[PDB]
Short mmCIF file of C-alpha atoms and ligand atoms in Angstrom, two decimals:
data_model
loop_
_atom_site.label_atom_id
_atom_site.label_comp_id
_atom_site.label_asym_id
_atom_site.label_seq_id
_atom_site.Cartn_x
_atom_site.Cartn_y
_atom_site.Cartn_z
CA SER A 1 -7.83 -4.62 -3.57
CA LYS A 2 -4.94 -2.16 -2.27
CA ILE A 3 -1.95 -3.59 -1.49
CA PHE A 4 0.78 -1.40 -1.32
CA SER A 5 4.74 -2.06 -1.96
CA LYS A 6 7.51 -1.47 0.56
CA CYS A 7 8.09 2.59 -1.00
CA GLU A 8 4.73 3.27 -1.43
CA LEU A 9 3.90 2.52 2.29
CA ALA A 10 6.82 4.39 3.30
CA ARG A 11 6.31 7.85 0.98
CA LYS A 12 2.73 7.49 3.02
CA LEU A 13 3.24 7.16 6.74
CA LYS A 14 6.55 9.84 5.62
CA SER A 15 3.61 12.32 4.97
CA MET A 16 1.44 11.21 8.22
CA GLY A 17 4.05 12.06 10.58
CA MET A 18 5.07 8.34 11.44
CA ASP A 19 8.88 8.58 10.69
CA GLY A 20 10.07 9.32 14.73
CA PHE A 21 6.29 8.53 16.12
CA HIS A 22 6.68 7.74 19.72
CA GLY A 23 10.72 7.44 19.21
CA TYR A 24 10.16 5.03 15.89
CA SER A 25 11.58 5.37 12.91
CA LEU A 26 9.93 4.78 9.34
CA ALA A 27 11.98 2.01 8.20
CA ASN A 28 10.30 0.18 11.71
CA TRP A 29 6.57 1.64 11.33
CA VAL A 30 7.45 -0.12 7.65
CA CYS A 31 8.97 -3.26 9.00
CA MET A 32 5.79 -3.73 10.89
CA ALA A 33 3.50 -3.69 7.75
CA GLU A 34 5.07 -5.87 5.80
CA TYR A 35 4.95 -8.87 8.24
CA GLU A 36 1.67 -8.39 10.03
CA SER A 37 -0.15 -7.94 6.90
CA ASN A 38 2.00 -8.17 3.82
CA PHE A 39 1.33 -4.61 2.68
CA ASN A 40 -2.66 -5.79 2.32
CA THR A 41 -5.16 -3.07 3.53
CA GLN A 42 -7.55 -5.86 3.29
CA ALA A 43 -5.80 -8.44 5.14
CA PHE A 44 -7.63 -10.79 7.94
CA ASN A 45 -7.13 -12.76 10.37
CA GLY A 46 -9.63 -14.74 12.37
CA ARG A 47 -8.05 -17.17 15.11
CA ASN A 48 -5.54 -14.53 16.63
CA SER A 49 -3.57 -16.13 19.72
CA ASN A 50 -6.51 -14.52 21.96
CA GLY A 51 -10.16 -15.40 19.81
CA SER A 52 -11.38 -12.58 18.23
CA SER A 53 -10.07 -10.95 14.35
CA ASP A 54 -7.05 -8.96 13.42
CA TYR A 55 -7.78 -5.98 10.86
CA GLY A 56 -6.12 -4.60 7.70
CA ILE A 57 -2.62 -3.40 7.00
CA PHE A 58 -1.73 -2.92 10.84
CA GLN A 59 -3.77 -5.84 11.95
CA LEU A 60 -5.63 -4.11 14.49
CA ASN A 61 -7.11 -6.71 16.99
CA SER A 62 -10.92 -5.87 17.23
CA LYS A 63 -11.20 -6.59 21.21
CA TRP A 64 -9.04 -3.80 22.18
CA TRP A 65 -8.68 -1.12 19.42
CA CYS A 66 -11.97 -1.00 17.15
CA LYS A 67 -15.72 -2.09 17.36
CA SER A 68 -17.96 -5.14 16.04
CA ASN A 69 -20.26 -7.25 17.68
CA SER A 70 -18.92 -10.88 17.84
CA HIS A 71 -18.11 -9.73 21.50
CA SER A 72 -17.56 -6.72 23.26
CA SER A 73 -15.11 -4.07 22.93
CA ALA A 74 -12.78 -1.67 24.45
CA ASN A 75 -12.90 0.50 21.20
CA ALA A 76 -10.17 2.73 22.06
CA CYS A 77 -9.97 3.76 18.40
CA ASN A 78 -13.55 4.44 18.67
CA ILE A 79 -14.17 3.40 15.27
CA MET A 80 -15.84 -0.07 13.40
CA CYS A 81 -13.47 -2.76 12.48
CA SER A 82 -14.63 -2.74 8.81
CA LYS A 83 -13.42 0.58 8.46
CA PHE A 84 -9.80 -1.20 8.54
CA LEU A 85 -10.49 -3.33 5.64
CA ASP A 86 -11.23 -0.34 2.88
CA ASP A 87 -8.59 0.96 0.73
CA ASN A 88 -7.79 4.65 2.64
CA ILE A 89 -5.07 3.74 5.54
CA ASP A 90 -5.87 7.45 6.96
CA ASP A 91 -7.83 5.64 9.61
CA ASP A 92 -5.68 2.80 10.27
CA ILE A 93 -2.83 5.51 10.98
CA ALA A 94 -4.78 7.33 13.54
CA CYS A 95 -5.42 4.23 15.29
CA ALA A 96 -2.15 2.82 15.05
CA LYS A 97 -0.64 5.71 16.84
CA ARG A 98 -3.15 5.25 20.00
CA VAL A 99 -1.46 1.81 19.82
CA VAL A 100 2.16 3.01 20.39
CA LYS A 101 1.06 4.70 22.95
CA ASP A 102 0.55 1.61 25.39
CA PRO A 103 3.06 0.32 27.48
CA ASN A 104 4.67 -2.40 25.12
CA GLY A 105 4.99 -0.03 22.76
CA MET A 106 5.24 -1.46 19.06
CA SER A 107 5.82 -4.99 20.41
CA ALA A 108 2.00 -4.68 20.49
CA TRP A 109 2.58 -6.69 17.23
CA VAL A 110 4.17 -9.84 17.33
CA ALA A 111 5.32 -10.03 13.52
CA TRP A 112 7.29 -6.46 14.18
CA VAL A 113 8.96 -8.14 17.57
CA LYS A 114 9.71 -11.47 15.07
CA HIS A 115 11.43 -9.82 12.59
CA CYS A 116 11.79 -6.06 13.20
CA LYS A 117 12.87 -5.18 16.50
CA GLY A 118 16.71 -7.44 16.64
CA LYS A 119 17.27 -6.31 12.45
CA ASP A 120 19.21 -3.70 11.73
CA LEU A 121 17.39 -1.37 9.27
CA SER A 122 19.30 1.28 8.36
CA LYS A 123 19.50 -0.09 4.75
CA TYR A 124 15.34 -1.13 5.12
CA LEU A 125 14.31 1.87 2.78
CA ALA A 126 17.70 2.61 1.13
CA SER A 127 16.31 2.04 -2.45
CA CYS A 128 13.39 4.25 -1.84
CA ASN A 129 12.80 7.73 -2.95
CA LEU A 130 11.29 9.59 0.27
CA1 LIG B 1 -9.28 2.55 6.52
#
């Protein structure tokens, strides 16, 4: 039952070199996690806009990013989706890095687009000790 708090997730992704990863700040990555999953490592959504399922803290779809069975999968991260439901987000970060490499950047995550892209996040982590 791993559920993160903003500042905890931040210190975490800040130690995985995410701050500025692909030109994206640390606040953006977190902001993304807050609205995609509410910082829940076990968050699940089985009726995505597509039709598959979104897994974990970053809600990685199973049609493009991880492998399952319900349907085929490019499984571009070469890892089973269930891994994204366990409490060590070490392997979810590695796959979220692959995602931002695609043409649409962090817009791959609709929630980040809805409540993060157009917002002023200069103080989003101000209360955090990093
Ligand atoms: Ca994991």
